[PDB]
Write an enzyme that holds these catalytic residues in place. Structure first.
Site, short mmCIF file in Angstrom:
data_model
loop_
_atom_site.label_atom_id
_atom_site.label_comp_id
_atom_site.label_asym_id
_atom_site.label_seq_id
_atom_site.Cartn_x
_atom_site.Cartn_y
_atom_site.Cartn_z
N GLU A 64 1.87 -6.91 8.58
CA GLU A 64 1.31 -6.94 9.93
C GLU A 64 0.54 -8.70 10.11
O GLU A 64 -0.17 -8.87 9.01
CB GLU A 64 0.41 -5.98 10.36
CG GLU A 64 -0.75 -5.84 9.37
CD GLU A 64 -0.38 -4.50 8.85
OE1 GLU A 64 0.52 -4.36 8.45
OE2 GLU A 64 -1.45 -3.65 8.67
N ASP A 99 4.91 3.81 6.63
CA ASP A 99 4.51 2.52 6.73
C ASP A 99 4.00 1.97 5.34
O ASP A 99 3.70 2.85 4.70
CB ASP A 99 3.47 2.03 7.80
CG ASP A 99 3.28 0.70 7.80
OD1 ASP A 99 4.15 -0.18 7.96
OD2 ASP A 99 2.08 0.29 8.55
N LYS A 120 -2.50 5.48 1.16
CA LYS A 120 -1.40 5.53 0.68
C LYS A 120 -1.22 6.57 -0.49
O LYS A 120 -0.17 6.98 -0.55
CB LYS A 120 -1.22 4.00 -0.11
CG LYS A 120 -2.14 3.63 -1.41
CD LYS A 120 -1.62 2.41 -1.90
CE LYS A 120 -2.84 1.71 -2.90
NZ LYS A 120 -3.35 2.65 -3.82
#
Ligand SMILES: Cc1c(Cl)c(C)[n+]([O-])c(Cl)c1-c1noc(-c2cc(O)c(O)c([N+](=O)[O-])c2)n1
Ligand SMILES: Nc1ncnc2c1ncn2[C@@H]1O[C@H](CSCC[C@H](N)C(=O)O)[C@@H](O)[C@H]1O
Ligand SMILES: [Mg+2]
Length: 213
Positions: free
Chosen positions: A197, A167, A142
């Site tokens: 997810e 994402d 990230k």
């Protein structure tokens, strides 16, 4: 063995060869019922599918391949002659990604770049015959979203209309990247709220369309 090897073995034993949709459903099934894994998943993947179908990109760059789930998801929707390049710094993961793409029959469409994005981005135009990118999928560590976005712009890899799809902008979160693209007039942003997810935790994808310098 590793969790990534067990995922590939489940695909080889359950998915139908040369069927990308069957490979995706096998990965999602194994990780829903046995071991969670950081594939983009079917909830956010369906949003990815819709974005890909709208823009029909000829050249896609992926940052972070892992096991190849997202690469299989995007490559199965590309037009003939289109290309997907994916960067993966973990050699164990990239070997899994190559075998995942081979099983799905998409090896001719995807090229795996072994190394770190910050080291491979400056070599795209010379070594892989790239002019500008039509779409970029950001899904690696990230803290690299924002510096790699600046690196892609510096190396002239972005054109007006280049679609950046990020994402995990909520969980685990990319605060500096999100604040930059939303605050900069160089990027027109749209948020697609979904779920992490294989979970009901709130997450989302951010689409940032490059508008020029
Ligand atoms: C599973 C989880 C849970 Cl249950 C909670 C409550 N929280 O807060 C977090 Cl942060 C996580 C979480 N761990 O890792 C990731 C993740 C997801 C990706 O889609 C991805 O691409 C990458 N990655 O490293 O590239 C990492 N998510
Ligand atoms: N700087 C970097 N350059 C290239 N790959 C990186 C990277 N930092 C992290 N990664 C890789 O990015 C992956 C993120 S998990 C991404 C999963 C994949 N996009 C999918 O949805 O199926 C990890 O496997 C990690 O090895
Ligand atoms: Mg992710």
């Amino acid at each position: 063995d590793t969790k990534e090897q067990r995922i590939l073995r489940y695909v080889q034993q359950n998915a139908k060869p040369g069927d990308p949709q069957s490979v995706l459903e096998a990965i999602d099934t194994y990780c829903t019922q046995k071991e969670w894994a950081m594939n983009v998943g079917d909830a956010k993947g369906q949003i990815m599918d819709a974005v890909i179908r709208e823009y029909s990109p000829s050249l896609v760059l992926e940052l972070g391949a892992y096991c190849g789930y997202s690469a299989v998801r995007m490559a199965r929707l590309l037009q003939p002659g289109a290309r997907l390049l994916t960067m993966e710094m973990n050699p164990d993961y990239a070997a899994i990604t190559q075998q995942m793409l081979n099983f799905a029959g998409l090896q001719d469409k995807v090229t795996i770049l072994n190394g770190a994005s910050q080291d491979l981005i400056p070599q795209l135009k010379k070594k892989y015959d790239v002019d500008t990118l039509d779409m970029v999928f950001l899904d690696h560590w990230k803290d690299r979203y924002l510096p790699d976005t600046l690196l892609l712009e510096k190396c002239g890899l972005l054109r007006k209309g280049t679609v950046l799809l990020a994402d995990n902008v909520i969980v685990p979160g990319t605060p500096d990247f999100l604040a930059y693209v939303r605050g900069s007039s160089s990027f027109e942003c749209t948020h697609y709220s979904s779920y992490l997810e294989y979970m009901k935790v709130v997450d989302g994808l951010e689409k940032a369309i490059y508008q020029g310098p």
